[PDB]
RNA sequence: GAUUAACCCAAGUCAAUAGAAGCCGGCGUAAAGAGUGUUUUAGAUCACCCCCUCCCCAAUAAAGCUAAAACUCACCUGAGUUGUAAAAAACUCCAGUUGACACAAAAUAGACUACGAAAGUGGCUUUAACAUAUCUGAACACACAAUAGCUAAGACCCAAACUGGGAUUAGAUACCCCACUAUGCUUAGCCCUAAACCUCAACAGUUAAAUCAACAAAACUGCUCGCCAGAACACUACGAGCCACAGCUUAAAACUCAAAGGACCUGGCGGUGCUUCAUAUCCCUCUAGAGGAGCCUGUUCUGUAAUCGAUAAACCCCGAUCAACCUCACCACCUCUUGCUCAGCCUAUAUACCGCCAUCUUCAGCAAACCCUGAUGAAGGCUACAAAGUAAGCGCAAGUACCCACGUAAAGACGUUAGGUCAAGGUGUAGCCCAUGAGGUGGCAAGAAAUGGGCUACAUUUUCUACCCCAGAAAACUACGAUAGCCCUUAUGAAACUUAAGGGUCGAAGGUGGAUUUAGCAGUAAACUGAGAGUAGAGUGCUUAGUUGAACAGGGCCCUGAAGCGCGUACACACCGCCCGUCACCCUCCUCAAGAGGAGACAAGUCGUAACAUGGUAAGUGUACUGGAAAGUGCACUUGGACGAACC
């Protein structure tokens, strides 16, 4: 890295700097005073202080990117969100008054809830023992869990099974399905959970 | 190089009583410091640093080891910790060196005035191969002209427009300053980054010092040193090696 | 291991001059160029002819002054003037040195069709930078 | 290390030399290299503690025996006086005893130098 | 401390040897390293509760939320406890002293199985 | 070997043979304390005065008894139990509880060190009982002697050679699992062997020194007995003795060799221990690929009259930043002979080299000169509350280049691989001189097959068009997909079916690729664009500039390595090491009913890998059974293995 180790990652949060001094604790005050003497990396172009910034959606867009084509990936993401919102509006209008309250129309909430539902709880690690390889169930960190959800969503949307269907439409359909706890990705999570439950007897093989 | 004088006379008798230790200067220094500590026992930071081992060797005209330097520095710190007098402080200050604490505070551009009397600040920025020179006026409607073109026409990508929005929005000054920036070189994103850096640097002249510090901490005023890495011979790219066959 | 123009280490008895003691990667960093002409500059020609002239001059001076040269020659080209600055040893009689100076200067002038001067700096012995 | 400072001070006061730090290998048997070809080695070495800090004989005892330097030495009941030229059996741990030894040796050296100066002055006078 | 008189096979010892050590019974000037304890699989009980609830609820997370949260909390506690255990091993509070400091102490006072 | 010279002796020289010259030395590991105890004849002075553990703990034989755990039986519950790295086989008259329950074996005590001559002896009780008022002493006897084994009769819970089955394996006559027998136990006889070793004889005495090869368990003295005298043949043959009959004890010789051996030093290595790490990295991970398709290009193989070299990491768009003629060194034919050169050779040798480099190195050590330790051996040389190291110099580092102090370059020693290049050039040695030299003309440089690296794709995050990011169409046999095939034109050139570019025509394999595998930690990977070197022209290649621009970066010592401390070592060109046994020929010797066996040498090929590292099942002794073979297993014993050496 061209940044010396002295450099620190910048913190982009307006509320963090607009916080009143009186509310600040001694630890926070000391941290703020110390940060005046450190070196700070340049703010990355990906993230800004815009109120419409979503780190989850930015990460999903980066994972969808192919060959550094972030314009196309961002276009696909915004088209997917627009398609989700349009489908939700269509369902809202076509539904009765009772069902209108339950129908969700925020694409961001739908996306976050779909990823949260797609998140696996217990993973499998291949462990060598006695010359064999065993799929030992293991706990998963939240980071790996979110990454697995995102990667499963993207891989399922990129599957060749869907013919001539554009990525925004496929991704919107999968997001709506996952938001309702249905679809191939939720089935993949269930299959992982079932395999872990079956291999539960191998859990003692783990040494960590 | 500084050379130590002959350490014994015609008769052969060495001048210093610690000659046969082989490190008479260092051990004499340690002896004096220990004696000062004993005297102090009998009686009962930011702008300075301890000298490095090389400085101590230059002072003593004797080769030293890292552990010897550690022992000396520990003894000096123990000397400082006590209720030292004026002479005991002068002895310490003999070895203490001065460190220039360069302020990380961003330099504020002077506020210049045009023919019409409007106030403005000019700055420059670089991102990869892109160089941008920006002028930010104290009063404005938020209009930004890039090479005489509106920034929404010049930047048809939402990411670049968000990059432009970042400095003003971070200090809650959207639509309050008019900007005229000329950028040359690099791609669209490098140009947007350079314009962002120049705009933030210029806008520092019209915000409070705390706001300038916040912008610096947010990364709006650091010149991004990340530039393209040269391709090396014998490998496909900057880091990509040729496929290796075993 | 790189071998180019490197005097390898030994038991510490081999004397090396400043020119020899520095590896090629020290050129323009710790040592200069033994020939100075405008041939290799951008937008210039006749570089190959200048290189061939330099090679021939070095070989000719090495052969004409056997065992006298104490270091590499320094060739300078100003206009059509060709200056050869050479560090020689104080062993030959000055009569022979002057004879060789006149001889080489006239021969090179009539060979390369340019005024050639030969400046000799004499040293009692080879200048030693270090012992490798 | 309890008496390094006292012994160094005594050596400085009496005009003689002291070694109370880690005895580097060869300070006596390799002095011509460490110091120089014209270094003058001590003509008498006085050990106020013949044992090193790991309860073995000080290497300087053996090295001074090699270099034919007579060694005066205070030897406790756990020391080895075989190679010490003039061993003095005595306690080497109590501060009182060590101070007594330092006083006696310093006074003897000072009296010797005073007598040498007096004899030289008297012989020049006559 | 067990007696060593008449144990080893030595001249003048009439009886057959009691001890046959493969190394001399002489104290070394160093102690063994701080041996790690082989890690065991953790949070197995909470994992079992979660998996049994999955089997009873057809792997529906909505019904099993409580047990799933318990298992996740146990996993996070186990990871943080492993990190804290590494920190404690660096600290060395649990033992009477770290092996490094003990080795330093033994270096200061070495064993002397020889004469001098 | 000849030749020149030299050396020794000399009327001799010296090839063969024989003789002369050998016991006061040792026995823990080199061969050697005989498995143990006790005599007479004898020997010794350690006998007498004169004496400090007498006695008790697990000596021995006999008789009796039994606490825990088994087996079996009985009731009641369940359909499983056993088995391990994982399984299978096996048993379900099985498993669990409870109760009854032995000719088997004797937790804890034992952190004790006792008894016995040794072998051995560690549950309890009782009886008998543990020689010698100097010492050594029997291999010419007498009496004992672990385990194994034989004989005869019994017991039989459990274990277990053999055997059978299951598994593993290339095979598995083993390791792993299951069942069972001889056997382990009792009684009466035999057998008489052990790494029967504490490899250290009994008795008396010393710690004085001249302590002392090394390691081990310090060095010795007096006396006596036993044993030993290069290795292998050889715990063998013959003879003799024995209750032993495939046996045990004593025990040679011939052929052969210049060694064998014991203990160490250093290094390497270990399917070696502990600890800490790996930061594109060893594993799980993240991204893009390779391996599947077509094409370009290199290589192997085949082919031709037709180069050469690299060819594991460290070869394979490599010498070439480049072969149509030239280049060219290849082949065929023709020609010249002091030849462009005070000749020439791209002839052999890179295992003679210089020159330039690869590689560990994505290391950090190399080393002059001294000094000290090892008893002055090979060797080694550090502890900071410091204990023998000091060290010039090279390297790292620092400085320097690009955009910083970061990063990338560059650098990167001594050495390793007799690593690459004799074809850059030079050059040692050897080789040709009417040719292995020089010139001219023409020509090969292909693909049965296999493979490496790239390029293009297999499309919808796509294809075409405009634009360079607010669009319109296409979207499966006229879709995506050739830079390929065929035809034509142009460029260069003297020469283009051949090289390049363009146009036309065609629209192929292919539908995200098995085992396996490469690279990347940030402006990096990925994708896109441009320029340069060299050419007359020529690469999908190389060098280089820029643009858009990510994901993971957290856990682990399980896998592979590194470092620190050790351990082992029969290896030392150093584990790609060494090494064992069976199955052919020849040679020598020995024992032989001349057929054959044995030993050694010769040393092959074959089948395994038994030993040396925890040698991948620790090794070995005795013994029994079994096996193609080293060998496997049972039982007891040994360390000539280790168990990491405070607690954790
Ligand atoms: K390929
Ligand atoms: Mg290199
Ligand atoms: Mg004392
Ligand atoms: Mg022996
Ligand atoms: Mg015996
Ligand atoms: Mg007797
Ligand atoms: Mg027996
Ligand atoms: Mg039986
Ligand atoms: Mg059984
Ligand atoms: Mg079995
Ligand atoms: Mg019994
Ligand atoms: Mg035994
Ligand atoms: Mg036998
Ligand atoms: Mg026999
Ligand atoms: Mg017989
Ligand atoms: Mg392929
Ligand atoms: Mg070839
Ligand atoms: Mg070849
Ligand atoms: Mg040709
Ligand atoms: Mg030729
Ligand atoms: Mg070579
Ligand atoms: Mg480099
Ligand atoms: Mg460097
Ligand atoms: Mg070779
Ligand atoms: Mg070769
Ligand atoms: Mg020819
Ligand atoms: Mg075409
Ligand atoms: Mg033409
Ligand atoms: Mg083996
Ligand atoms: Mg084995
Ligand atoms: Mg065995
Ligand atoms: Mg068997």
Swiss-Prot record, chain B:
GO terms for cellular component: mitochondrial inner membrane; mitochondrial small ribosomal subunit; mitochondrion; nucleolus. The chain holds residues 133 to 395 of 396 of the full protein. It is found in: Mitochondrion. Residues 225-246 are annotated as: Disordered. This is Small ribosomal subunit protein uS9m. It comes from the Eukaryota. Belongs to the universal ribosomal protein uS9 family. Keywords: Acetylation, Mitochondrion, Ribonucleoprotein, Ribosomal protein, Transit peptide. The modification N6-acetyllysine is found at residue 138. Component of the mitochondrial small ribosomal subunit (mt-SSU). Mature mammalian 55S mitochondrial ribosomes consist of a small (28S) and a large (39S) subunit. The 28S small subunit contains a 12S ribosomal RNA (12S mt-rRNA) and 30 different proteins. The 39S large subunit contains a 16S rRNA (16S mt-rRNA), a copy of mitochondrial valine transfer RNA (mt-tRNA(Val)), which plays an integral structural role, and 52 different proteins. GO terms for biological process: mitochondrial translation. GO terms for molecular function: RNA binding; structural constituent of ribosome.
From Swiss-Prot, chain C:
One of its GO terms (cellular component) is mitochondrial inner membrane. Its main location: mitochondrion. GO terms for biological process: mitochondrial translation. Coiled coil: none annotated. Keywords: Mitochondrion, Ribonucleoprotein, Ribosomal protein, Transit peptide. GO terms for molecular function: RNA binding; structural constituent of ribosome. Transmembrane segments: none annotated. It is found in: Mitochondrion. It comes from the Eukaryota. Component of the mitochondrial small ribosomal subunit (mt-SSU). Mature mammalian 55S mitochondrial ribosomes consist of a small (28S) and a large (39S) subunit. The 28S small subunit contains a 12S ribosomal RNA (12S mt-rRNA) and 30 different proteins. The 39S large subunit contains a 16S rRNA (16S mt-rRNA), a copy of mitochondrial valine transfer RNA (mt-tRNA(Val)), which plays an integral structural role, and 52 different proteins. Belongs to the universal ribosomal protein uS3 family. This is Small ribosomal subunit protein uS3m. It comes from Homo sapiens (Human). The lineage of its organism: Eukaryota, Metazoa, Chordata, Craniata, Vertebrata.
From Swiss-Prot, chain D:
Coiled coil: none annotated. It is found in: Mitochondrion. It is linked to Combined oxidative phosphorylation deficiency 36: An autosomal recessive, multisystem disease resulting from deficiencies of mitochondrial respiratory enzyme complexes and mitochondrial dysfunction. Clinical manifestations include sensorineural hearing impairment, mild developmental delay, hypoglycemia, and intellectual disability. Required for mitoribosome formation and stability, and mitochondrial translation. Belongs to the universal ribosomal protein uS2 family. Component of the mitochondrial small ribosomal subunit (mt-SSU). Mature mammalian 55S mitochondrial ribosomes consist of a small (28S) and a large (39S) subunit. The 28S small subunit contains a 12S ribosomal RNA (12S mt-rRNA) and 30 different proteins. The 39S large subunit contains a 16S rRNA (16S mt-rRNA), a copy of mitochondrial valine transfer RNA (mt-tRNA(Val)), which plays an integral structural role, and 52 different proteins. This is Small ribosomal subunit protein uS2m. It comes from Homo sapiens (Human). The lineage of its organism: Eukaryota, Metazoa, Chordata, Craniata, Vertebrata.
From Swiss-Prot, chain E:
Transmembrane segments: none annotated. Residues 40-82 form the CHCH domain. Its main location: mitochondrion. Pfam families: CHCH. A motif (Cx9C motif 2) lies at residues 64-74. Disulfide bonds join 43-74, 53-64. InterPro entries: CHCH (IPR010625), Cys_alpha_HP_mot_SF (IPR009069), Ribosomal_mS37_met (IPR033620). Keywords: Disulfide bond, Mitochondrion, Nucleus, Ribonucleoprotein, Ribosomal protein. GO terms for biological process: mitochondrial translation. It is found in: Mitochondrion; Nucleus. A motif (Cx9C motif 1) lies at residues 43-53. GO terms for cellular component: cytosol; fibrillar center; mitochondrial inner membrane; mitochondrial small ribosomal subunit; mitochondrion; nucleoplasm. GO terms for molecular function: RNA binding. Belongs to the mitochondrion-specific ribosomal protein mS37 family. PANTHER family: CHCHD1, SMALL RIBOSOMAL SUBUNIT PROTEIN MS37. Component of the mitochondrial small ribosomal subunit (mt-SSU). Mature mammalian 55S mitochondrial ribosomes consist of a small (28S) and a large (39S) subunit. The 28S small subunit contains a 12S ribosomal RNA (12S mt-rRNA) and 30 different proteins. The 39S large subunit contains a 16S rRNA (16S mt-rRNA), a copy of mitochondrial valine transfer RNA (mt-tRNA(Val)), which plays an integral structural role, and 52 different proteins. This is Small ribosomal subunit protein mS37. It comes from Homo sapiens.
């Amino acid at each position: 890295s061209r940044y010396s180790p002295e450099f620190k990652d910048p913190l982009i949060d307006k509320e963090y700097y607009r916080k009143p001094v009186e509310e600040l604790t001694e630890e926070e005050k000391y941290v703020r005073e110390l940060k005046k003497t450190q070196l700070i990396k340049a703010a990355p172009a990906g993230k800004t202080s815009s109120v419409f910034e979503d780190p989850v959606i930015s990460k999903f867009t980066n994972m969808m990117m192919i060959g550094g084509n972030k314009v196309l990936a961002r276009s696909l993401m915004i088209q997917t969100l627009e398609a989700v919102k349009r489908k939700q509006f269509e369902k809202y209008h076509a539904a009765s008054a009772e069902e209108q309250a339950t129908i969700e129309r925020n694409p961001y909430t739908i996306f976050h809830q779909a990823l949260k539902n797609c998140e696996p709880m217990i993973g499998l690690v291949p462990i060598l023992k006695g010359g064999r390889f065993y799929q030992v169930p293991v706990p998963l960190p939240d980071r790996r869990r979110r990454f697995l959800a995102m990667k499963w969503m993207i891989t399922e949307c990129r599957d060749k099974k869907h013919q001539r269907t554009l990525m925004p439409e496929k991704l919107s359909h999968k997001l709506l399905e996952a938001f309702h706890n249905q679809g191939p990705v939720i089935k993949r999570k269930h299959d992982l959970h079932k395999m872990a439950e079956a291999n539960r007897a191998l859990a003692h093989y783990r040494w960590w | 190089p500084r050379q130590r004088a002959i350490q014994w006379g015609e008769d052969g008798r060495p001048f210093h009583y610690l000659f046969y230790t082989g490190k008479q200067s260092y051990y004499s220094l340690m002896h004096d410091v220990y004696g000062m500590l004993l005297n102090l026992e009998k009686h009962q930071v930011i702008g300075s640093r301890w000298l490095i081992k090389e400085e101590l060797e230059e002072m003593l005209v004797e080769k030293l080891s890292d552990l010897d330097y550690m022992q000396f520095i520990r003894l000096l710190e123990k000397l400082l910790t006590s209720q030292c007098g004026a002479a005991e402080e002068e002895f310490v200050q003999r070895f203490r060196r001065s460190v220039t604490l360069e302020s990380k505070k961003q330099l504020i551009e002077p506020v210049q005035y045009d023919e019409q009397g409007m106030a403005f600040s000019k700055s420059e920025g670089k991102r990869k191969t892109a160089k941008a020179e920006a002028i930010v006026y104290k009063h404005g409607s938020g209009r930004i002209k890039v090479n005489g073109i509106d920034y929404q026409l010049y930047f048809p990508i939402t990411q670049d427009r968000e990059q432009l929005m970042f400095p003003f929005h971070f200090v809650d000054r959207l639509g309050k300053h008019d900007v005229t920036c000329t950028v040359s070189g690099g791609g669209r994103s490098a140009q947007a980054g350079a314009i962002r850096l120049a705009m933030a640097k210029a806008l520092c002249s019209f915000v409070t010092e705390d706001e300038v510090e916040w912008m610096r901490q947010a990364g709006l005023l650091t010149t991004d040193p990340r530039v393209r890495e040269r391709k090396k011979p014998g490998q496909e790219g900057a880091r990509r090696k040729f496929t290796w066959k075993k | 291991k790189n071998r180019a123009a490197r005097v390898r280490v030994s038991k510490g008895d081999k004397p090396v001059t400043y020119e020899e003691a520095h590896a090629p990667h020290y050129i323009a960093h710790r040592k200069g160029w033994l020939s100075l002409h405008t041939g290799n500059l951008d937008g210039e020609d006749h570089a190959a002819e200048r290189t061939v002239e330099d090679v021939f001059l070095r070989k000719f001076m090495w052969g004409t002054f056997p065992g006298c040269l104490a270091d590499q020659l320094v060739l300078k080209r100003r206009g059509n003037q060709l200056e050869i600055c050479a560090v020689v040893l104080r062993q030959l009689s000055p009569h022979k040195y002057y004879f060789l100076v006149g001889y080489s200067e006239t021969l090179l002038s009539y060979f390369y069709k340019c005024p050639v001067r030969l400046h000799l700096q004499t040293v009692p012995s080879k200048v030693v930078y270090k012992y490798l | 290390r309890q008496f390094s400072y006292l012994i160094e001070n005594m050596a400085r006061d009496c005009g003689e030399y002291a070694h109370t730090r880690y005895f580097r290998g060869g300070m006596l048997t390799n002095a011509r290299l460490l110091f120089g070809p014209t270094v003058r080695l001590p003509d008498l070495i006085i050990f106020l503690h013949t044992l090193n800090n790991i309860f073995e004989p000080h290497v300087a005892v053996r090295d001074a025996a090699k270099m034919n330097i007579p060694t005066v030495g205070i030897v406790d009941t756990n020391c080895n006086p075989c190679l010490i030229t003039y061993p003095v059996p005595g306690n080497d741990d109590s501060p009182l005893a060590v101070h007594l030894y330092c006083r006696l040796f310093q006074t003897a050296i000072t009296r010797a130098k005073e007598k040498r100066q007096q004899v030289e002055a008297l012989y020049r006078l006559q | 401390t067990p007696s060593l008189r008449g144990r080893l096979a030595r001249f003048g010892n009439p009886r057959k040897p009691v001890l046959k050590p493969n190394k001399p019974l002489i104290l070394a000037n160093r102690v063994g390293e701080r041996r790690r304890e082989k890690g065991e699989a953790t949070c197995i009980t909470e994992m079992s509760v979660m998996m049994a609830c999955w089997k009873q609820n057809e792997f529906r997370d909505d019904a099993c939320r409580k047990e799933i949260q318990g298992f996740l909390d146990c996993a996070a506690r186990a990871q943080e406890a492993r990190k804290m255990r590494s920190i404690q091993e660096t600290l060395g509070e649990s033992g009477s002293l770290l092996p490094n400091k003990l080795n330093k102490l033994l270096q200061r006072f070495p064993n002397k199985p020889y004469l001098s």
